[PDB]
Structures are given as C-alpha cells and as structure tokens.
Amino acid sequence: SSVLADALNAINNAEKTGKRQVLLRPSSKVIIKFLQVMQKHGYIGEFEYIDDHRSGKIVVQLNGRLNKCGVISPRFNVKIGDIEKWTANLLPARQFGYVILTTSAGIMDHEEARRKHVSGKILGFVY
Amino acid sequence: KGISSSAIPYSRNAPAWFKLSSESVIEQIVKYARKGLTPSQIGVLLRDAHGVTQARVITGNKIMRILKSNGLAPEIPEDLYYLIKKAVSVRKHLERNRKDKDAKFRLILIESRIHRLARYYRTVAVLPPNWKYE
Amino acid sequence: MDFTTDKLRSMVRKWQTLIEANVTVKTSDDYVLRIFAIAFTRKQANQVKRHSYAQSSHIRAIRKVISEILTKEVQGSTLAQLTSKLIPEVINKEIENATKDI
Amino acid sequence: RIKKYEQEAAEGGIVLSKVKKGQFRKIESTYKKDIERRIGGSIKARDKEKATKRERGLKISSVGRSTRNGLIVSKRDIARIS
Amino acid sequence: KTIWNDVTRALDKHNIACVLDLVEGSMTVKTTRKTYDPAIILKARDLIKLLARSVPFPQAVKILQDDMACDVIKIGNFVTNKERFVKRRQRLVGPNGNTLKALELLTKCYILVQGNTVSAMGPFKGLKEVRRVVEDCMKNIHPIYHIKELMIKRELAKRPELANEDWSRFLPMFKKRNVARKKPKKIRNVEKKVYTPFPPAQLPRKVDLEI
RNA sequence: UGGUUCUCUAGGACUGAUUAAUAGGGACGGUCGGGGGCAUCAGUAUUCAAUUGUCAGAGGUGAAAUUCUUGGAUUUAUUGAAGACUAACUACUGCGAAAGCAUUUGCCAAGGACGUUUUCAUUAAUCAAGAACGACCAUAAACUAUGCCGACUAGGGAUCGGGUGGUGUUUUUUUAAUGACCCACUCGGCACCUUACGAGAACUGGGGGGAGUAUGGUCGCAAGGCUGAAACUUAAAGGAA
C-alpha cells in the first residue's frame, strides 16, 4: 500500500472505532501537510511528530468531526475551472468537505487553491 | 514473520565511556579482516570484546567502507557469498543422497533467493554483469 | 526378570512422558544381558500447570545418564551380584539420584 | 447442564455430536424433561438479530472504486469530467 | 470423591477393599481375608479402570455382575490423515448422536467414543457386534448398514424357523460394489518421468535479460 | 624460560553525501521439533519352522459350513526365521509449503521463533504463463456438514518455543557446563471464548422454486380365462373346490 493511504486508513478507522488518539507510522512531509490542512479546517485536534531517527511517528488527537479521509490514487491534474466539477463529482454534497491538492504553492484544499488562483494535481479528500 | 531485530539507540555519539581511539578501532578492524573474518564477524567481535557499540557511530563510516578504503574489499558481497556457499552445501548433500525431496525443495528456494539479490547487485553493478552462479 | 503387564499399565498416565531406555551389556562373567528401564516424568509440588512434560532434550539427556549409569552398574557386577543388586530396587535409587538434576 | 456435560466430555476424551451455533445441545435431560417444548431449540430473538444483515451506512460517492489504497478514478472518468 | 462411598458399599458386598488415593491420583482394589469369590477382583479392576476412563458410577457398577464385560476398541491405527480419521469417527458417533444411541439400543451396550479408542460395556454378543461395527466403520463402510443389518437380524432371530438357515439372502450388507477396472493403454504409466534430484534453473526477468 | 641434583636454598644452552523502516536479506548465539535423508538399535505381536508335554477336537458363525486335525490340530514351554509396525505415553499439543511426520543412537545438510548497541541498504508485495513436490502379486473414495466476510479494535483463560527480571522450593559440593517448578513482563505460534467497526458494490457440458392435483392428447406396459386342447368338445396327468 501507499504511505499516505495507510496513515489515512488508520486515522479513519481509529475514529470510526471511537478512539481519541491515533499513532501513525511512518511520517512524511505530505502527511504533515495533509494533517495540517485538515486541522486548519477543524477535523483533527493537535498532533505531534515524535522524531525517532528512522522516519517519524505522529500522534494525532481527534475528537469527532471527521468521517472519511482518502487519497485519489492517480494524481491527475485538475484545473481552476474544473475544481468545482471535481468537488461536485467526489464530495458528498455542495459545500461539504474539501478536496486537497498538491499545487505549485504546496498542499492546499480546493477552495484555498481557487481562492489564490492556482491549480495542481489532486491528492485526497476530507469531509 | 517475527519481529526480532536490533534496536539502534537514538544517540549517534560515542557513549562517553568509550575511551579508546577512533583510529585504533580501524587498526583492529583491518587486522581482523586481514586475518580473515567477514564484516559481520568484525562487527560482532568489536562489539563484544573491545566495546565499540557500532563503528558507523564511533569511527567515521561503516566498516565495509573502512575495509574498501583500507584495501580489504570482498570479492563478492557477504550476503551473496553466504547464500552461495549454503546452496553449494545443499547441492553436495543432494549428490550424496538423492532421495531428499525436501532438500531439493529448499535448494529451489535458496536458488531463487540467490537470483533475487544477484539481480539487485548486478543492476547496481557491485559485481560485474555476466555473472552466473556457475 | 519381567514386570507384570498390570504394573506398567498401572504406571502409565497421560499428561507426562515416559522415558524408556535399554542397554545390551556384558557382565563380569560372559553373560550378555539386554536390560531395560522405564521412568515417568513427575510434576513438582507447587506445580500448577497440568502438564509436566519433558522437552525431549531433557529426555535425551535423561536417557543418556540412564544408559551410562546402569551400564556402570553392570560391568562391576556378576550375575549373582546384579541379582542381589536389583532385588532391593536400588539401581532405581541410583537413577533417581543421578537424574534429579534434570 | 449443557455446559457441564460438554465440558466434562471435553476434559475426558469423549467425542460429542456437533451442533449449530445458537442451538441448544440436545441431552438426556432434554429428552426426559420435555424441555424443548418450553424453551425451544434456540433463542430465536438472538437467532433473528444474528440473521439480520449489517447496517452498512449511507452510500456517498459515485466517482471511483474505494479500496485500501484509496480511490481509483479511471481514465475514462478523468476524461469525462475534465 | 463424591461417589466413593457407593463404591465401598458395592464392593464390600463382595468383600473387596478399595482405597482412593487423592495425592498420587490412584484407585486400588485389594482382595481381603474374606473373599471367597476368586474372580471378582478382576471385575473390581475393570470397575476402577472404567471409573478412570470416565464412565459414571451407575453405569460402571453393572460390571460387577457375571453377564457383563468391557472392551476397548482401538481405532487410531486404521487410516492415515487426520481429516478422514475425524470424519469417520464423527460418522461413528452420528448426527445428534443418533447412530451411537441406536447402536447402544440394539447391542444393549454402553459405548463411549473417546479420543482414538472406543470403550464399551455389555454382554458378550453385544461386544462382538459393536467391535465388528466399529472396525468396519473405521474401514470405509458406513455404520448405518450395520445398524440396518442389526435390526434385520433381530427381526430375523425372533422367528422359530429360519434359525438354522443362512441369512445372507436377507441381509442387504453384501453389496457387490467393487465393479470398476481401469483399462488404459499405459502410455506414460509404464515408465515416464524419471526423478532427478537437481532442479532446473529459472526463467530470468527482462531486467536480467537486459543486464 | 628450562633438561638435573646439593640443602625459596647450586652451574649449564639461551578516492570525493543521509537514514537504517515494529520493510526485506545475510551473519552470529543458545537452542527447538514425531521436518527430511542415510545408517544403526530395540520392542512385542503375527505368520512359519524345529523341539518337547498332553490328547480329540480347534477355527468360525446369529446358527452353520469351506479349512486344519491321532502322519497329533488347538493349548503350553524353549528357540529360530521372515515381513511389517512403532501400542499405552498421544493432547482441540509439536513440526512441515502441502500431501504428511511418532522406537534408540549417530552422521548429513536444512528450517523456524527468540536474543542482538552485527552486516547490506530498498535489495521489496501479488499472481495469468512456466517449474518443483504431491511379462509378474492386486487395490476404494465420499456418505450430514456450518460459518458472515475484511483493509478491522481491544481483550480473557489455557498451551508450545525463546528471552528478561524476581526470590523460594526441589537441586547441590573444587571435574565441565547444564536443570525442574512458582510469579510478573515480552516476542512469535496452534487453537478456543468473546468484543467494536467497515460497502463488502461497480475437473467442461445447466434449466428454473418447493409441495401437490387433474388428464376424452401422444408414446408405452398391462386384462381375458382351468391347462393338456386345436383343424379334433379329445387321452393320461395336474390344478381348483
């Protein structure tokens, strides 16, 4: 499996089982930015990067507000004009959740990406 | 599958009781290698008796780099050499007694494992291409 | 010499191991004897696990010392000396004392 | 009675006949006491709540396949949406 | 420990002492000074090993009477694989225990299928019947054939005539099911596929073929 | 550092980038197992034979029978030979990729788990294809069964292999090392008993439910009526009553 996918799988089903903390290993910059944007929108609480010298561990604390993480496995390019279409086709509803993209300006959600007018490849979603 | 490996400490320093020299360790390393031990045996003897924890920490670099920069390079990597000699030991067992179908099966497994990392070492070109396992 | 069958059927219980040995020994005369031995693995007092099995290397070591010390009790006996030795069951006490270390 | 009987037989050697998962093991007191007319062969409330199927939430997405590697969106769908 | 006083009653009417040792875990029976029946110590032996083999007490004191004896059939040494062994032994027990209970009823015996042996108590004709039933059940023929022929033989033995004629025409047990015979030309089965101990090498990958 | 004799007390030959995955491989260590191969050893049955002892039956069956038997069967005792097999111990235990594997001892290679402040440094995971294992003497396999699946949380008791710690009893001593049990922790297994939470979708040949009912259709099979005995009112004999 991937390295973002099993971290998001742990952070998904741990919250489904109703835990208040996940430990996810290993940890990359893209995982830090994904948890960064989802705590910017308020889906997880704090999280902490314990640096062992191998790859890093994250302890996320998460309350109740998430209900699905994911990754879109072909990292196809989206456009600023088709951000609205891709959110319509993969989100649950109209203003429900965020598609998260790797852009020129880094990892951002879809509405921040179209706010500062930059497209990029898709990464994953959260709602 | 079991989880039984070694747990490298978080420190990257000499342990502050290691009063020996960073060069006398290298001289002991090349002495043991020239009297003829594989690098894993150098590391375990150095760890057990002259208490360097690990020599990538206490010396500059790892000990196969120390042996290659001091002139004691291996003909073939230690993994491939040990798997080669295990395969030829099973092959001599099979020529001795020819009703050991289980040992024939283990020979197929050992030969597959030979080809895997021989392919890896060949595409890295540690060992030259047109290398065959006889 | 031979046991009755009811004695060793009365000795065999499950949840233990029987270590049995035998040696073909020539005495201080020129009688050659095949002499057997049986032993059953006890459980200690305070043992709470129900098994008390031997780990089969303890079986090989126990059977080794059984063979060695009873082939030491023969060759060091004649037939009359061996018979007077195995009437009061004392080679069994020699085996027990030599094997309680294992 | 059933647990004591099948536990006694299990700690002995005794091979017992095989029952299904929620049923009561039929024993000599079952046949003599006429107990199954009063208690049934199995607790059918637990049989009903085990025979029901798991409540599988509400289906959300439509765009791709959802496996443990994430969401596969096919190239046909990428060309259709883009 | 519970039933032990009943054992002392049921043996002291035969003048046999018995101890129950609870530290070494044993049961001994001894002929005392007042035992005029010479053979009853054998039935006391069978009684205490029945108690050890985990039959209950009101079942096991029916061994102290002359018309009843034990048998311990051995079923472990018949078939090879564990799957076929446990399926034939469960076939010996039956669905819901029906085969075993019908066998106890027909043979007038008490049968325990335990481990890899079969204990049985009963009269000697019943013991002969259950031994042949169990051994042929460990061989491949199903035990309900033997239950059917036992019912046939009971309803065939309760008539006054036909008691010196052979019942083999009435028994359906004689099946004549051995009626196949392979008749190929033996192309490879004469001598094919000689065994060599050394394996062939593997087809290498495209990576290997290019390096 | 010594070949000896005079009381430790007497000379002697002497080049120029990172980790080190609760990914993978390899080494090491003490081990572990009914994993395999070869050799060896034993056991008591069985069958056969030799030698006694004794005499009329022995098998076998629901009863019988084929069979053996005064040229001594069966039973008993001593001994030999053969081919198998490894009883009880034997387990919801172990090992093996599966089929499978149970006597001892030795050799040959192998394997797993654990321990590791050893080594290499991505060498990795899945499977269509393909490969390995699976003229003589003639043989059985299935046959009542079960269960909700996975990418999934925690446990509980018991058990097998390793390790660490504790500090009591069996052990014991200046010959080597080495146990057994109790307890806690921990890793890995064969199972068992529970829990919480998830879309879990996108050796080949097949008609259409279960239980029945009717039939002016089609294809069949089937009745009569004493036989002999019909062209013959016909014998003997048989049947029936």
Curated annotation (Swiss-Prot), chain A:
Family: Belongs to the universal ribosomal protein uS8 family.
Oligomeric and partner information: Component of the small ribosomal subunit (SSU). Mature yeast ribosomes consist of a small (40S) and a large (60S) subunit. The 40S small subunit contains 1 molecule of ribosomal RNA (18S rRNA) and 33 different proteins (encoded by 57 genes). The large 60S subunit contains 3 rRNA molecules (25S, 5.8S and 5S rRNA) and 46 different proteins (encoded by 81 genes).
Keywords, alphabetical: Cytoplasm, Ribonucleoprotein, Ribosomal protein
Annotated localization: Cytoplasm
Name the UniProt record assigns to this protein: Small ribosomal subunit protein uS8B
Miscellaneous field: Present with 19700 molecules/cell in log phase SD medium. There are 2 genes for uS8 in yeast.
GO biological process, one term: cytoplasmic translation
Listed GO MF terms: structural constituent of ribosome
Record organism: Saccharomyces cerevisiae (strain ATCC 204508 / S288c) (Baker's yeast)
Cystine crosslinks: none
Function: Component of the ribosome, a large ribonucleoprotein complex responsible for the synthesis of proteins in the cell. The small ribosomal subunit (SSU) binds messenger RNAs (mRNAs) and translates the encoded message by selecting cognate aminoacyl-transfer RNA (tRNA) molecules. The large subunit (LSU) contains the ribosomal catalytic site termed the peptidyl transferase center (PTC), which catalyzes the formation of peptide bonds, thereby polymerizing the amino acids delivered by tRNAs into a polypeptide chain.
Swiss-Prot record, chain B:
GO terms classed as biological process: cytoplasmic translation; maturation of SSU-rRNA from tricistronic rRNA transcript (SSU-rRNA, 5.8S rRNA, LSU-rRNA)
InterPro entries attached to this UniProt entry: Ribosomal_uS15, Ribosomal_uS15_arc_euk, Ribosomal_uS15_N, uS15_NS1_RNA-bd_sf
NCBIfam families in alphabetical order: PRK08561.1
Cross-link (Glycyl lysine isopeptide (Lys-Gly) (interchain with G-Cter in ubiquitin)): 31, 35
Family: Belongs to the universal ribosomal protein uS15 family.
Name assigned to this protein: Small ribosomal subunit protein uS15
Modified residues (Phosphoserine): 24
A GO term for molecular function: small ribosomal subunit rRNA binding
Gene Ontology CC entries for this record: 90S preribosome; cytoplasm; cytosol; cytosolic small ribosomal subunit; nucleolus
Keywords: Cytoplasm, Isopeptide bond, Phosphoprotein, Ribonucleoprotein, Ribosomal protein, Ubl conjugation
Subcellular location: Cytoplasm
Assembly and oligomerization: Component of the small ribosomal subunit (SSU). Mature yeast ribosomes consist of a small (40S) and a large (60S) subunit. The 40S small subunit contains 1 molecule of ribosomal RNA (18S rRNA) and 33 different proteins (encoded by 57 genes). The large 60S subunit contains 3 rRNA molecules (25S, 5.8S and 5S rRNA) and 46 different proteins (encoded by 81 genes).
Superkingdom classification of source: Eukaryota
Annotated source species: Saccharomyces cerevisiae (strain ATCC 204508 / S288c) (Baker's yeast)
From Swiss-Prot, chain C:
Annotated localization: Cytoplasm
Annotated disulfide bonds: none
Lineage: superkingdom: Eukaryota
Description of post-translational modifications: N-terminally acetylated by acetyltransferase NatA.
Record's subunit section: Component of the small ribosomal subunit (SSU). Mature yeast ribosomes consist of a small (40S) and a large (60S) subunit. The 40S small subunit contains 1 molecule of ribosomal RNA (18S rRNA) and 33 different proteins (encoded by 57 genes). The large 60S subunit contains 3 rRNA molecules (25S, 5.8S and 5S rRNA) and 46 different proteins (encoded by 81 genes). eS1 interacts directly with uS11 and eS26, which form part of the mRNA exit tunnel.
Family in the record: Belongs to the eukaryotic ribosomal protein eS1 family.
Function: Component of the ribosome, a large ribonucleoprotein complex responsible for the synthesis of proteins in the cell. The small ribosomal subunit (SSU) binds messenger RNAs (mRNAs) and translates the encoded message by selecting cognate aminoacyl-transfer RNA (tRNA) molecules. The large subunit (LSU) contains the ribosomal catalytic site termed the peptidyl transferase center (PTC), which catalyzes the formation of peptide bonds, thereby polymerizing the amino acids delivered by tRNAs into a polypeptide chain.
Note: Present with 92400 molecules/cell in log phase SD medium. There are 2 genes for eS1 in yeast.
Entry protein name: Small ribosomal subunit protein eS1A
Boundaries of the shown chain within the full protein: 103 to 204 of 255
UniProtKB/Swiss-Prot annotation, chain D:
Superkingdom field: Eukaryota
Subcellular location: Nucleus, Nucleolus
Summary of subunit composition and partner proteins: Interacts with KRR1.
Physiological role: Required for pre-rRNA processing and 40S ribosomal subunit assembly. Seems to act in the processing of 35S rRNA at the A(0), A(1), and A(2) cleavage sites.
Protein known as: Protein FAF1
Species this protein is from: Saccharomyces cerevisiae (strain ATCC 204508 / S288c)
